[PDB]
Amino acid sequence: XVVXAX
Amino acid sequence: XVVXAX
Amino acid sequence: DNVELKDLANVLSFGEAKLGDNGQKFNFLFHTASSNVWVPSIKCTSESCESKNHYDSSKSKTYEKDDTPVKLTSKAGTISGIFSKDLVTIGKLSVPYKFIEMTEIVGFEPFYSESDVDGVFGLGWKDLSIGSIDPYIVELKTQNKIEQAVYSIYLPPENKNKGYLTIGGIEERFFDGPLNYEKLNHDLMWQVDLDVHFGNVSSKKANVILDSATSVITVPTEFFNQFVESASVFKVPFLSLYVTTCGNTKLPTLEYRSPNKVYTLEPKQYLEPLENIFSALCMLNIVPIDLEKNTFVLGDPFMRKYFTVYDYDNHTVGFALAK
Amino acid sequence: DNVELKDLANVLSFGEAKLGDNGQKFNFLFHTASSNVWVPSIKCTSESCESKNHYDSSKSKTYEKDDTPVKLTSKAGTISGIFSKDLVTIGKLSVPYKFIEMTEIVGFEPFYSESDVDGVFGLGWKDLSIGSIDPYIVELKTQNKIEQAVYSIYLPPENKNKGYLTIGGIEERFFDGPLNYEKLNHDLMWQVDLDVHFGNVSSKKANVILDSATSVITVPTEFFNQFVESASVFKVPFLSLYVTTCGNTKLPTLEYRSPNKVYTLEPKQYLEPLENIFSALCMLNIVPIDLEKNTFVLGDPFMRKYFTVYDYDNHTVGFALAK
């Protein structure tokens, strides 16, 4: 794992 | 996991 | 005032929040790094929408229509719906709020449907904000229902009790010692520029982000490999999982340093045992990732020691230990 | 004739296949349960398309335009593109083929982009086939370039050498003992109706499917729990991973029975060690899943013992051991 920035 | 039928 | 958080899948950040002038309940992920909050619509036509909690614009008479299409193409997969306005309620707080009526998601499985979470509650910044709207948190001092624009996230240090999120003041019952503010280096997210050490490896002035959405501490890749190479550790072969002893000495303390106070993570804190109780075997909560330039990320395990607070009114972040 | 398969992420089914009248190479997943084959377009505009191998319709002069939009909304996430016709080449075989020019995928990450695979080579059936087109394999006896409509998948039993996929005849150098055909119970996929036992637990006449796309043996959920409850095993908490000793006795043989010959899987075969070499600890390749009614699934680990062959000309499936 749950990874939420790119 | 890689599960591919529903 | 306070909100209760429960554990989902070793990401203890779900909470309840309400839409509209009746009780429209949604399991919320209070994201620090996402900007706009969004909800599964009754008119959501997607496969996983089946079991998740629905927003019925029509049964709540506050619905201020916007009904303009939104294309939220995230990093994983795609969320698209239609803007909607209504009252948004946390505890004693309710207000005029522009959010997203979601009709369709794709790439957020396999993780979404298994979990209880329904909605992503954005707690971020305006620049990140498409629709160029101030955030819930900011539109409460703007529209007085509370005093100062600040939130705090409390995760209990024995991962057993209830966790909290407060909005109003710093609730002192939470932290321990002095509380430390730090200086944001972006107006984009709750990130700050820190020096960070593990082994001999160090990356001076590296940008870091608090993220309540993420369940592991993140570190650039070549950071990772440099200690890790000799730091005998293993894998679920070509699938991102990493492993060693729970009884491990070689292991360093995650040192997160700043001209005020250092924030350290002990081996005992970024490892989780596997054979349940009495296990030899542990998984780090560290995954190697280049999000961007010298970007580390602090997710649950971090918040699981350091109590964090987030200040729009000061562009500051809360840092202390937990009760 | 033969094609070489390599290991991806404990799913040793990728291979090379070519599009068009020049060398247009794509890493292919030879799916048994998907019908239409598809490829990443040069005009694919999606995030992960960046590094994957591209089809340039224009540099290959065989391009028979169809250019009609396709909405391949799979189980995970969504693939959409535009039908295209061209020569499709495996080894010595090339032919007039209607496939999918893919421009956009969403929900197939995080798994797609990390892997080397580029394309899904459908090896399935017509009913599954949207576009109501006969499959590659069938349009070769139809348009003579080989004799009989049959494929065989060879995965080596020590997971070290090269794996093969043949199309033409049963290549006898592969199997061991008699080869066993079985009788399909659907014209939809390569599935067959079998009795299947683990513990005392048994599910008489349960439908099963060979799937080269899937890296674990699947079993209905309540099948699973019934032995597993006392079958002391563990987890990566609320995330689908399951674990016990590599030195484990309690463990049953996957018995897959039919009025001809039984296909058994030994504990030693659906477990994989974790501490690399000299490990105490293993992960089953069994995940509990209700796809449908009494549906089991046989993926890589199965093929990793039993050599499988697939016969359109007989509606039959190959079953023997491996060399």
XYZ file of C-alpha atoms in Angstrom:
658
model
C 2.746 -2.685 0.260
C 0.000 0.000 0.000
C 1.942 2.869 -1.390
C -0.126 5.823 -2.288
C 3.261 10.551 -4.608
C 4.822 10.227 -8.206
C 0.051 -13.818 -6.667
C -0.438 -13.213 -10.437
C -3.890 -14.547 -10.927
C -5.276 -13.989 -14.330
C -11.067 -16.273 -15.004
C -14.073 -14.479 -13.206
C -12.407 17.317 18.352
C -11.461 13.568 17.985
C -12.140 10.793 15.435
C -11.600 7.018 15.951
C -9.251 5.169 13.639
C -9.095 1.448 13.256
C -6.699 -0.938 11.802
C -7.192 -2.034 8.191
C -4.183 -4.070 6.894
C -1.380 -2.754 8.930
C -2.509 0.716 7.792
C -4.352 1.941 10.836
C -5.916 4.876 9.162
C -9.534 4.368 8.503
C -12.188 6.522 10.116
C -15.785 7.453 9.708
C -16.992 10.630 7.958
C -20.504 11.662 6.866
C -21.985 13.248 3.737
C -25.213 15.223 3.517
C -28.029 16.178 5.933
C -28.794 12.563 6.814
C -26.283 9.840 7.961
C -24.170 8.927 4.940
C -21.296 6.939 6.313
C -18.015 6.178 4.548
C -14.943 4.444 5.712
C -12.272 6.992 5.113
C -8.699 6.905 4.457
C -7.341 10.148 5.762
C -4.661 10.830 3.335
C -2.089 13.350 3.999
C -0.656 13.355 0.502
C -3.750 13.462 -1.487
C -5.670 16.644 -1.949
C -9.303 16.130 -2.852
C -11.621 13.808 -0.854
C -13.739 11.387 -2.866
C -16.674 8.946 -2.409
C -18.211 5.874 -4.111
C -21.500 6.974 -5.767
C -24.803 5.094 -5.699
C -24.493 5.581 -9.506
C -20.969 4.070 -9.373
C -21.001 1.381 -12.047
C -17.778 -0.338 -11.346
C -17.162 -3.983 -10.393
C -15.936 -3.412 -6.718
C -18.561 -0.660 -6.047
C -20.895 -3.576 -5.225
C -20.135 -3.747 -1.462
C -18.712 -0.344 -0.627
C -20.733 2.499 1.056
C -22.672 4.739 -1.368
C -23.416 8.419 -1.720
C -26.961 9.161 -2.743
C -26.912 12.867 -3.771
C -30.660 12.882 -3.996
C -31.646 11.726 -0.501
C -29.455 14.462 0.966
C -31.105 17.799 0.148
C -27.972 19.881 0.603
C -26.650 18.547 -2.705
C -25.249 21.652 -4.416
C -24.860 20.328 -8.052
C -21.583 20.745 -9.938
C -21.985 17.489 -11.869
C -18.781 18.262 -13.910
C -16.631 15.226 -14.869
C -13.272 14.517 -13.079
C -10.413 12.313 -14.378
C -8.443 11.210 -11.330
C -5.736 9.176 -12.963
C -3.634 8.148 -10.003
C -0.261 6.333 -9.794
C -1.854 2.820 -9.448
C -4.976 3.094 -11.552
C -7.821 5.372 -12.393
C -10.610 7.022 -10.502
C -13.212 9.051 -12.439
C -16.530 10.547 -11.347
C -18.371 13.826 -11.098
C -17.825 16.732 -8.753
C -20.490 17.224 -6.150
C -21.088 19.752 -3.317
C -22.560 18.988 0.054
C -22.128 19.042 3.777
C -19.176 16.927 5.024
C -19.271 15.834 8.655
C -16.588 14.721 10.995
C -17.929 14.362 14.487
C -19.143 17.839 15.454
C -17.985 19.386 12.154
C -20.089 19.753 9.037
C -19.680 22.337 6.277
C -20.275 23.359 2.621
C -17.827 20.999 0.718
C -16.851 20.401 -2.923
C -15.880 16.682 -3.207
C -15.869 13.817 -5.849
C -18.854 11.601 -6.658
C -17.104 8.537 -7.909
C -18.700 6.381 -10.614
C -15.734 4.377 -11.886
C -12.282 3.096 -10.652
C -10.034 0.674 -12.227
C -6.473 0.141 -11.189
C -6.774 0.341 -7.444
C -7.535 -3.236 -6.997
C -6.546 -5.867 -5.776
C -6.245 -3.793 -2.622
C -9.406 -1.844 -2.576
C -12.010 -4.438 -2.687
C -10.589 -6.626 -0.009
C -10.280 -3.782 2.473
C -13.085 -2.085 4.271
C -12.060 1.379 3.098
C -14.634 3.211 0.989
C -13.293 6.624 0.494
C -10.154 8.655 0.304
C -10.307 11.770 2.456
C -7.788 14.178 0.948
C -5.893 16.216 3.674
C -3.311 17.870 1.473
C -2.687 21.094 -0.415
C -4.177 23.458 -2.975
C -1.587 22.950 -5.736
C -2.170 19.145 -5.595
C -5.901 20.289 -5.615
C -7.417 20.063 -9.125
C -10.566 22.230 -9.001
C -8.179 24.745 -7.290
C -10.211 24.477 -4.013
C -8.901 25.075 -0.433
C -9.000 21.797 1.670
C -11.610 20.784 4.158
C -9.252 21.582 6.871
C -8.692 25.118 5.558
C -12.410 25.790 5.025
C -13.328 25.682 8.638
C -11.343 28.684 9.925
C -12.478 30.287 6.714
C -16.010 29.291 7.651
C -15.847 29.265 11.478
C -16.775 25.963 12.947
C -13.344 25.628 14.563
C -10.511 27.944 15.549
C -7.132 26.868 14.103
C -6.350 24.829 10.957
C -4.551 21.844 12.367
C -4.689 18.047 12.570
C -3.027 15.470 14.516
C -2.784 11.793 13.988
C -2.385 9.475 16.923
C -1.482 5.828 16.465
C -0.999 3.868 19.623
C 2.583 2.515 20.176
C 1.316 -0.948 21.186
C -0.700 -1.631 17.937
C -3.726 -2.715 19.921
C -5.857 0.298 21.176
C -7.776 2.887 19.209
C -6.072 5.556 17.083
C -7.196 9.133 16.741
C -7.325 11.981 14.536
C -7.992 15.367 16.009
C -8.873 18.622 14.566
C -8.927 21.864 16.679
C -5.904 22.069 19.043
C -2.769 19.951 19.852
C -4.309 17.435 22.290
C -1.572 17.063 24.876
C -2.715 13.652 26.183
C -1.104 12.129 23.075
C 2.488 13.187 22.913
C 5.377 12.973 25.294
C 8.203 15.425 25.735
C 8.343 18.682 23.721
C 6.499 18.772 20.483
C 8.644 19.786 17.450
C 7.659 21.708 14.538
C 9.457 21.430 11.315
C 9.641 23.616 8.238
C 7.961 22.525 5.004
C 10.051 22.741 1.881
C 6.975 22.481 -0.417
C 3.529 23.913 -0.464
C 2.542 20.726 -2.351
C 2.478 18.133 0.379
C 3.381 17.713 4.025
C 7.125 17.145 3.142
C 10.204 18.443 4.677
C 13.834 18.525 3.895
C 15.811 16.276 6.229
C 19.100 14.452 6.537
C 18.595 10.748 6.880
C 21.007 7.965 7.870
C 20.911 4.226 8.117
C 24.246 2.442 7.700
C 27.262 4.381 6.728
C 24.889 5.464 4.071
C 23.514 8.981 4.370
C 21.752 11.310 2.041
C 22.265 14.914 3.191
C 19.274 17.347 2.646
C 16.888 14.765 1.270
C 13.245 15.655 0.826
C 10.778 13.541 2.901
C 7.038 13.158 3.104
C 4.637 12.119 5.691
C 2.159 9.699 4.226
C -0.672 8.050 6.224
C -1.724 6.213 3.028
C 1.424 4.189 2.957
C 2.245 1.303 5.193
C 6.075 1.245 4.983
C 9.010 3.513 5.305
C 10.403 4.369 1.872
C 13.829 4.987 0.839
C 15.514 5.629 -2.461
C 16.759 2.515 -4.118
C 20.432 3.002 -4.100
C 20.145 4.085 -0.519
C 18.616 0.775 0.079
C 21.026 -1.484 -1.728
C 24.148 0.053 -0.185
C 23.704 -1.196 3.358
C 21.330 -3.943 2.353
C 23.816 -5.677 0.080
C 25.866 -6.972 2.968
C 22.868 -6.464 5.302
C 21.952 -10.103 4.625
C 18.237 -9.987 3.762
C 15.988 -11.989 1.424
C 12.935 -11.853 -0.893
C 9.693 -13.288 -2.305
C 11.571 -13.738 -5.700
C 10.877 -10.752 -8.200
C 7.947 -9.590 -5.892
C 8.388 -6.772 -3.488
C 8.708 -8.310 -0.017
C 11.901 -8.310 2.055
C 13.101 -10.376 4.983
C 15.435 -11.173 7.864
C 15.687 -12.264 11.473
C 13.571 -10.728 14.160
C 16.561 -11.358 16.368
C 18.821 -9.143 14.223
C 21.824 -7.059 15.535
C 23.480 -5.798 12.217
C 20.564 -3.533 11.810
C 20.781 0.241 12.099
C 18.432 2.827 13.535
C 16.551 4.870 11.028
C 17.979 8.162 11.758
C 15.892 11.140 10.495
C 17.947 14.305 11.457
C 17.182 18.053 11.483
C 18.624 21.193 13.040
C 16.162 20.750 15.955
C 15.611 17.097 16.967
C 16.371 13.770 15.396
C 13.735 11.157 14.731
C 15.002 7.724 15.075
C 13.602 4.427 14.233
C 14.923 1.387 15.959
C 15.174 -1.963 14.266
C 12.485 -3.150 16.623
C 10.151 -0.690 14.988
C 10.395 -1.372 11.211
C 10.295 -5.075 11.404
C 7.242 -7.285 11.705
C 7.381 -10.986 12.753
C 5.851 -13.606 10.471
C 5.288 -16.932 12.302
C 2.744 -14.818 14.389
C 3.757 -15.119 18.181
C 7.330 -16.663 18.946
C 8.636 -16.133 15.332
C 12.211 -16.127 14.213
C 11.269 -14.123 11.116
C 10.588 -10.569 10.191
C 9.745 -8.289 7.254
C 11.108 -4.742 7.058
C 8.799 -1.958 6.415
C 11.130 -0.569 4.083
C 10.729 -0.769 0.405
C 13.117 0.852 -1.994
C 11.501 3.423 -4.228
C 12.519 6.481 -6.344
C 9.336 8.554 -6.279
C 11.366 11.532 -7.270
C 14.548 13.197 -6.222
C 16.035 12.034 -2.957
C 12.607 11.315 -1.754
C 11.961 9.310 1.308
C 8.550 8.584 2.647
C 7.251 8.072 6.147
C 4.119 5.936 6.455
C 2.390 4.039 9.154
C 5.279 2.523 11.084
C 6.562 6.065 11.542
C 3.379 7.456 12.783
C 3.256 4.355 14.928
C 6.025 5.907 17.132
C 6.139 9.526 16.469
C 2.862 11.368 17.035
C 2.323 13.686 14.096
C 0.613 16.967 13.764
C -0.147 18.977 10.741
C -0.351 22.820 10.705
C -1.727 24.805 7.794
C -1.764 27.839 10.066
C 1.988 27.495 10.502
C 3.209 25.495 7.479
C 4.622 23.355 10.315
C 4.585 19.644 11.263
C 4.106 17.999 14.580
C 6.665 15.607 15.985
C 6.706 13.934 19.303
C 6.537 10.503 20.807
C 3.253 8.723 21.780
C 1.255 7.707 24.980
C 7.973 -26.468 -33.764
C 9.427 -25.158 -30.409
C 9.530 -21.798 -28.576
C 11.791 -20.871 -25.603
C 10.195 -19.788 -22.354
C 11.971 -18.032 -19.565
C 11.255 -17.354 -16.019
C 9.586 -14.059 -15.100
C 8.510 -13.988 -11.397
C 7.939 -17.574 -10.653
C 5.678 -17.597 -13.736
C 7.913 -19.221 -16.292
C 5.777 -18.393 -19.226
C 7.206 -15.660 -21.293
C 8.279 -16.205 -24.875
C 9.058 -14.271 -27.977
C 6.572 -13.694 -30.825
C 6.781 -11.367 -33.846
C 4.362 -8.987 -35.574
C 4.516 -7.836 -39.183
C 6.898 -8.350 -42.139
C 9.899 -7.008 -40.236
C 11.130 -8.091 -36.722
C 8.616 -6.769 -34.202
C 9.426 -8.528 -30.986
C 7.181 -8.820 -27.930
C 7.615 -10.652 -24.728
C 4.573 -12.822 -24.591
C 2.587 -14.349 -21.959
C 1.053 -17.413 -23.483
C -2.204 -17.508 -21.775
C -4.310 -20.502 -21.858
C -7.376 -18.847 -20.395
C -7.451 -15.732 -22.353
C -8.727 -15.663 -25.872
C -7.457 -12.746 -27.912
C -3.727 -11.860 -28.151
C -2.816 -8.212 -27.641
C 0.185 -5.838 -28.017
C 1.424 -2.463 -26.685
C 1.103 0.107 -29.524
C 3.678 2.728 -30.500
C 0.619 5.036 -30.116
C 0.011 3.582 -26.618
C -0.307 6.627 -24.380
C -0.270 5.031 -21.021
C 2.188 5.551 -18.146
C 3.875 2.018 -18.193
C 3.941 1.868 -22.052
C 7.198 3.845 -21.724
C 9.573 0.828 -21.582
C 7.594 -2.009 -23.109
C 8.044 -3.254 -26.749
C 5.946 -1.390 -29.352
C 3.942 -2.276 -32.421
C 4.378 0.143 -35.271
C 1.540 -0.727 -37.716
C 3.033 1.552 -40.302
C 6.552 0.131 -40.640
C 5.051 -3.306 -41.249
C 3.319 -3.203 -44.642
C 1.068 -6.184 -43.998
C -1.057 -4.032 -41.691
C -4.627 -4.932 -42.681
C -6.574 -2.024 -40.985
C -9.570 -2.726 -38.749
C -8.887 0.244 -36.468
C -12.159 -0.459 -34.513
C -12.054 0.284 -30.745
C -11.894 -2.587 -28.151
C -12.810 -2.358 -24.433
C -10.937 -5.162 -22.696
C -12.115 -4.684 -19.158
C -10.404 -7.533 -17.370
C -10.720 -8.825 -13.772
C -7.782 -6.680 -12.444
C -8.020 -3.538 -14.523
C -8.639 -2.294 -17.995
C -7.028 -2.746 -21.354
C -8.374 -0.760 -24.334
C -6.998 -0.282 -27.843
C -7.871 -0.801 -31.473
C -8.132 -3.997 -33.463
C -5.424 -4.533 -36.012
C -4.625 -7.265 -38.596
C -1.199 -8.488 -39.532
C 1.166 -11.386 -39.772
C 1.927 -13.047 -36.396
C 5.112 -15.096 -36.179
C 6.183 -17.800 -33.843
C 9.406 -19.354 -34.992
C 8.643 -20.820 -38.422
C 4.960 -19.800 -38.266
C 3.516 -16.559 -39.567
C -0.048 -15.935 -40.737
C -2.906 -13.447 -41.379
C -3.971 -12.493 -37.755
C -6.593 -10.221 -36.163
C -5.110 -8.998 -32.824
C -5.325 -5.925 -30.436
C -3.311 -2.722 -30.835
C -3.215 -1.535 -27.286
C -3.166 2.194 -26.507
C -4.224 2.258 -22.859
C -4.166 -0.030 -19.722
C -4.880 0.832 -16.236
C -5.431 -1.696 -13.526
C -2.809 -4.256 -14.381
C -0.133 -2.625 -12.442
C 1.771 -2.936 -10.062
C 2.653 -6.212 -11.742
C 2.976 -5.277 -15.322
C 5.523 -2.624 -15.284
C 7.996 -4.396 -13.111
C 7.970 -7.528 -15.240
C 9.496 -7.926 -18.630
C 6.264 -9.144 -20.207
C 4.897 -6.968 -23.006
C 2.025 -8.824 -24.419
C -0.648 -11.330 -23.647
C -0.852 -14.082 -26.243
C -4.380 -15.464 -25.992
C -4.479 -19.328 -26.482
C -8.088 -19.937 -25.561
C -11.505 -20.322 -27.151
C -13.966 -18.668 -29.511
C -16.742 -17.972 -26.980
C -14.227 -16.131 -24.716
C -13.241 -14.484 -28.113
C -14.881 -11.049 -28.534
C -14.631 -10.267 -32.270
C -15.925 -13.894 -32.619
C -12.598 -14.943 -34.283
C -11.029 -18.469 -34.277
C -7.665 -18.511 -32.313
C -4.207 -18.359 -33.747
C -3.818 -21.951 -33.038
C -6.983 -22.837 -34.970
C -6.092 -20.636 -37.956
C -3.113 -22.622 -39.004
C -4.800 -25.928 -39.919
C -7.439 -23.694 -41.408
C -4.661 -21.930 -43.285
C -2.060 -24.716 -43.669
C 1.244 -23.830 -42.179
C 1.041 -26.777 -39.776
C -0.841 -30.060 -39.577
C -2.729 -30.500 -36.274
C -4.104 -27.858 -33.867
C -2.226 -28.611 -30.698
C 0.130 -27.070 -28.138
C 2.209 -28.297 -25.425
C 3.821 -26.507 -22.587
C 6.999 -27.825 -21.068
C 8.350 -26.470 -17.802
C 11.442 -28.146 -16.507
C 11.011 -29.996 -13.137
C 14.237 -28.526 -11.707
C 13.258 -24.798 -12.187
C 16.590 -24.024 -13.792
C 16.695 -24.977 -17.570
C 14.708 -23.594 -20.468
C 10.963 -24.188 -20.883
C 9.194 -24.823 -24.144
C 6.103 -24.397 -25.949
C 5.500 -26.492 -29.003
C 3.040 -26.350 -31.721
C 2.694 -29.184 -34.333
C 2.883 -32.656 -32.696
C 3.261 -34.110 -29.131
C 7.063 -33.894 -28.752
C 7.861 -37.116 -26.936
C 11.209 -35.947 -25.496
C 9.201 -34.021 -22.882
C 6.900 -36.393 -21.112
C 7.399 -39.623 -19.274
C 5.065 -42.576 -19.102
C 1.756 -42.610 -21.035
C 0.271 -39.314 -21.943
C -3.360 -38.817 -20.761
C -6.038 -37.014 -22.410
C -8.915 -35.640 -20.530
C -12.374 -34.496 -21.532
C -13.259 -30.796 -21.493
C -16.476 -29.867 -19.773
C -16.565 -26.388 -21.417
C -15.887 -25.006 -24.816
C -14.954 -21.765 -22.997
C -11.557 -22.560 -21.577
C -9.185 -25.470 -21.144
C -11.132 -26.730 -18.023
C -12.163 -30.110 -17.006
C -14.357 -31.652 -14.437
C -12.334 -33.470 -11.789
C -12.539 -34.782 -8.257
C -9.976 -33.170 -6.038
C -8.776 -34.060 -2.528
C -6.441 -32.598 0.013
C -7.192 -33.441 3.646
C -10.301 -35.286 4.502
C -11.712 -32.521 2.447
C -12.892 -33.440 -1.034
C -15.052 -31.781 -3.589
C -16.525 -34.409 -5.934
C -16.962 -33.357 -9.657
C -15.399 -29.938 -9.305
C -14.601 -27.935 -12.406
C -10.869 -27.107 -12.905
C -8.858 -24.966 -15.261
C -5.409 -24.993 -16.544
C -3.959 -21.528 -16.358
C -0.384 -20.635 -17.430
C -1.097 -17.003 -16.432
C -1.390 -17.882 -12.805
C 1.438 -18.707 -10.498
C -0.368 -20.707 -7.766
C -2.729 -23.559 -7.373
C -6.215 -22.285 -6.548
C -8.798 -23.762 -4.464
C -12.200 -22.657 -3.303
C -12.135 -20.875 -0.015
C -14.023 -23.178 2.190
C -12.023 -26.003 0.744
C -9.054 -24.158 1.940
C -10.092 -23.292 5.454
C -11.273 -26.804 6.328
C -7.907 -28.526 6.425
C -5.996 -25.308 6.852
C -7.691 -24.378 10.110
C -5.856 -27.033 12.061
C -3.198 -27.196 9.305
C -1.198 -24.659 11.330
C -0.221 -21.990 8.783
C 0.284 -18.215 8.950
C -0.054 -14.904 7.045
C 1.213 -11.461 5.997
C -1.721 -9.937 8.077
C -4.845 -9.041 5.822
C -2.605 -9.501 2.654
C -2.729 -12.642 0.646
C 0.415 -14.624 1.487
C 0.442 -17.900 3.426
C 3.118 -19.774 5.325
C 4.540 -22.797 7.121
C 7.556 -25.028 7.581
C 9.486 -26.376 4.663
C 10.056 -29.366 6.889
C 6.309 -30.070 7.183
C 4.711 -33.582 7.621
C 0.959 -32.711 8.327
C 0.680 -31.727 4.756
C -1.356 -33.651 2.201
C -0.788 -34.428 -1.451
C -2.856 -32.455 -3.864
C -4.848 -35.173 -5.296
C -6.492 -34.357 -8.680
C -8.528 -37.541 -9.617
C -10.298 -38.712 -12.800
C -11.635 -41.958 -14.227
C -8.269 -42.434 -16.017
C -5.251 -41.290 -13.955
C -4.791 -39.204 -10.865
C -2.605 -36.133 -10.760
C -0.978 -35.642 -7.502
C 0.925 -32.858 -6.031
C 3.265 -33.541 -3.199
C 3.879 -31.069 -0.429
C 7.378 -30.707 -1.777
C 5.879 -29.268 -4.916
C 3.534 -26.450 -3.756
C 5.812 -24.962 -1.234
C 8.625 -22.508 -1.835
C 11.391 -21.761 0.734
C 11.969 -18.172 1.831
C 15.377 -17.739 3.542
C 16.752 -18.665 -0.001
C 19.110 -21.791 0.405
C 18.937 -23.705 3.876
C 15.549 -22.118 4.895
C 13.187 -23.357 7.526
C 10.315 -21.483 5.873
C 7.957 -21.947 3.013
C 4.996 -20.359 1.213
C 2.245 -22.495 -0.320
C 1.239 -21.908 -3.804
C -2.199 -22.170 -2.852
C -4.464 -19.261 -2.494
C -8.106 -19.606 -1.656
C -10.402 -18.199 -4.294
C -14.057 -18.576 -5.462
C -13.781 -17.693 -9.147
C -17.057 -19.405 -9.707
C -18.679 -22.654 -8.813
C -16.409 -25.313 -7.399
C -13.650 -23.914 -9.435
C -10.099 -24.862 -8.879
C -7.248 -23.566 -10.917
C -3.952 -25.085 -11.930
C -1.142 -22.622 -12.638
C 2.574 -22.745 -12.864
C 3.498 -25.107 -10.045
C 1.239 -27.656 -11.718
C 2.719 -27.316 -15.079
C 6.023 -27.449 -13.263
C 5.450 -31.234 -12.732
C 2.886 -32.362 -15.120
C 3.683 -31.682 -18.775
C 0.564 -30.280 -20.391
C -0.771 -30.464 -23.852
C -3.676 -28.748 -25.393
C -5.791 -30.233 -28.245
C -8.331 -28.236 -30.211
C -8.458 -31.104 -32.686
C -9.619 -33.394 -29.895
C -11.124 -31.105 -27.226
C -8.564 -33.005 -25.115
C -5.784 -32.084 -22.647
C -2.334 -33.459 -22.265
C -1.132 -34.892 -18.986
C 2.104 -36.551 -18.223
C 5.170 -36.066 -16.118
C 8.307 -34.137 -17.274
C 11.990 -34.834 -18.375
